[PDB]
Amino acid sequence: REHWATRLGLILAMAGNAVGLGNFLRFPVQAAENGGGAFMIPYIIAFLLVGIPLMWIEWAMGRYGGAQGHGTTPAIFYLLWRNRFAKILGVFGLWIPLVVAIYYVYIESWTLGFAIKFLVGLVPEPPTDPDSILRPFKEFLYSYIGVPKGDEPILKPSLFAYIVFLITMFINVSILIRGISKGIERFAKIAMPTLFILAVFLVIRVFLLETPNGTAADGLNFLWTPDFEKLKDPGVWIAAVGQIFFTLSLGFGAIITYASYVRKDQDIVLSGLTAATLNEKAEVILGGSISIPAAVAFFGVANAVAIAKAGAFNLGFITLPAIFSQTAGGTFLGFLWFFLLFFAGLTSSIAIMQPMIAFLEDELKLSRKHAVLWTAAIVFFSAHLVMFLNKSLDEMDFWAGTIGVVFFGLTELIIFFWIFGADKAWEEINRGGIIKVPRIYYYVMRYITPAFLAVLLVVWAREYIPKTHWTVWITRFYIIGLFLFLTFLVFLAERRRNHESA
Numbered sequence: 001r002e003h004w005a006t007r008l009g010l011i012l013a014m015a016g017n018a019v020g021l022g023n024f025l026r027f028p029v030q031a032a033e034n035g036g037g038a039f040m041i042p043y044i045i046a047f048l049l050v051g052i053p054l055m056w057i058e059w060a061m062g063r064y065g066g067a068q069g070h071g072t073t074p075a076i077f078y079l080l081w082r083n084r085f086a087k088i089l090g091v092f093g094l095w096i097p098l099v100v101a102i103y104y105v106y107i108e109s110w111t112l113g114f115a116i117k118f119l120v121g122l123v124p125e126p127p128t129d130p131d132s133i134l135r136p137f138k139e140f141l142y143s144y145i146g147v148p149k150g151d152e153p154i155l156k157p158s159l160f161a162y163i164v165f166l167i168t169m170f171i172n173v174s175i176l177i178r179g180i181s182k183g184i185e186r187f188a189k190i191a192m193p194t195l196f197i198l199a200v201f202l203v204i205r206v207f208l209l210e211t212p213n214g215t216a217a218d219g220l221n222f223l224w225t226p227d228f229e230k231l232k233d234p235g236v237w238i239a240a241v242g243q244i245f246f247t248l249s250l251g252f253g254a255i256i257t258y259a260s261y262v263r264k265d266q267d268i269v270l271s272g273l274t275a276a277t278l279n280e281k282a283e284v285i286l287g288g289s290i291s292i293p294a295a296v297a298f299f300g301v302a303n304a305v306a307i308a309k310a311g312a313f314n315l316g317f318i319t320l321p322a323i324f325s326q327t328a329g330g331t332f333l334g335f336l337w338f339f340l341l342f343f344a345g346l347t348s349s350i351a352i353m354q355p356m357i358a359f360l361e362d363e364l365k366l367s368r369k370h371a372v373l374w375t376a377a378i379v380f381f382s383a384h385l386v387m388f389l390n391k392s393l394d395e396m397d398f399w400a401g402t403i404g405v406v407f408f409g410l411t412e413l414i415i416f417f418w419i420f421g422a423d424k425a426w427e428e429i430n431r432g433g434i435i436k437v438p439r440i441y442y443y444v445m446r447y448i449t450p451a452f453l454a455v456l457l458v459v460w461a462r463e464y465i466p467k468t469h470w471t472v473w474i475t476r477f478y479i480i481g482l483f484l485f486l487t488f489l490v491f492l493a494e495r496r497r498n499h500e501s502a
């Protein structure tokens with residue numbers, strides 16, 4: 001079985017896994033919608049009571065399974081808990097990362113395309129009407145992804161966007177086809193530092209932004225100014241936890257698959273903690289210091305929160321480039337922005353496809369080449385639904401990247417620390433650790449977290465899920481199909497094993 005060649009490569013591959021679109025896109029909007037500082041508090045708490053412990057847990061399950069040659073949840077869940085239902089539940093560790101991968105890779109392709117257009121210097125030139133700076137860029141995005149002008153909820157992507165999607169796919173493939181150490185690690189070692197540099201540069205340049213409506217400092221204040229009256233609101237907590245999961249790549253079965261290539265004796269404690277910490281540094285310090293500060297600078301707090309409430313793509317692909325077009329070399333600034341987003345995205349997508357590739361390799365004994373190619377075929381094909389059908393992406397994102405990850409986090413936590421046993425789980429997590437997990441975190445894992453997530457999920461299913469266009473079903477149907485498909489594969493897998501044992 002393959003293993004991470006180096007320590008640093010492992011760390012940067014993990015951080016590369018976690019740090020991505022969720023940082024510079026999802027987060028700014030999550031904090032903006034939820035009131036800035038008000039959103040932060042629960043966030044922080046969620047990071048302490050959920051993100052860290054679950055990170056450790058996933059590292060542990062990953063390494064544990066990998067030692068025996070299994071990097072995916074369908075098998076690992078079975079090893080930890082011997083049941084058919086353990087496999088059936090483990091399927092989610094494929095379905096989730098695949099479904100999310102479908103639209104994720106697409107958005108990534110968007111960032112690539114925009115990077116190219118901002119690089120070549122083909123960008124909308126705004127003619128002081130506040131919307132008039134935005135309108136051209138809105139038309140730009142809509143023209144790129146082909147928003148549904150008609151009654152029908154149909155999208156008409158540009159040829160260029162489609163080609164850029166093909167190219168993006170090919171990039172992902174070229175990276176994943178070289179393996180864990182050569183393909184993913186080597187790339188992480190470059191993309192990560194590059195990303196960091198770009199991010200810092202952009203944060204500075206943004207901190208230099210000022211208009212009659214405010215300064216980046218205003219945005220920073222809004223973001224970091226605590227509100228203690230918003231904590232009684234369940235929604236803010238649900239958003240905070242969801243954001244934690246998404247940004248830390250927890251519940252996607254990706255962290256597990258990566259951890260499965262960690263040598264049995266290597267440290268999963270200091271490493272995992274380091275990945276988490278890096279991701280959070282990129283999350284709050286970098287991602288939060290660009291979009292929000294800029295928007296608040298130009299349009300002020302109120303309009304900033306309005307724009308964020310509107311959409312994540314509003315802030316990322318419209319507001320920010322529009323704000324840059326008002327500055328010298330703002331076009332090149334836009335190019336830096338979208339290039340950054342592109343690298344982050346890539347480093348994440350490879351990570352979400354790796355689980356499927358790893359199932360094909362481990363369980364069905366497919367060569368790396370074939371595994372990769374087929375995974376890419378499935379993703380590329382399924383992507384068409386997200387492409388031509390409006391709100392399909394939203395559906396996939398909510399069911400897989402939002403609910404699915406929380407539910408699956410709870411599931412894996414219950415399987416590892418409850419059914420598999422708490423003491424054995426703890427011992428497994430701490431084994432080989434350069435440092436040991438603080439004693440308190442035992443209880444946090446065994447009691448606090450599962451309760452927190454259970455209650456959270458209940459409230460979520462009651463008050464929220466009820467809060468759509470029929471086409472959504474077209475998506476749901478399809479994704480449900482995928483699940484069955486995966487199940488079937490699992491089935492086939494468990495059959496091969498038998499014939500192999502006989």
Ligand SMILES: CC(C)C[C@H](N)C(=O)O
Binds near residue numbers: 017018019
């Ligand atoms: C679903 C995950 C791949 C998301 C990734 N950790 C990000 O924040 O961009």
Ligand code: NA
Binds near residue numbers: 019022247283
């Ligand atoms: Na992240």
Ligand code: NA
Binds near residue numbers: 015019020021349
């Ligand atoms: Na990434």
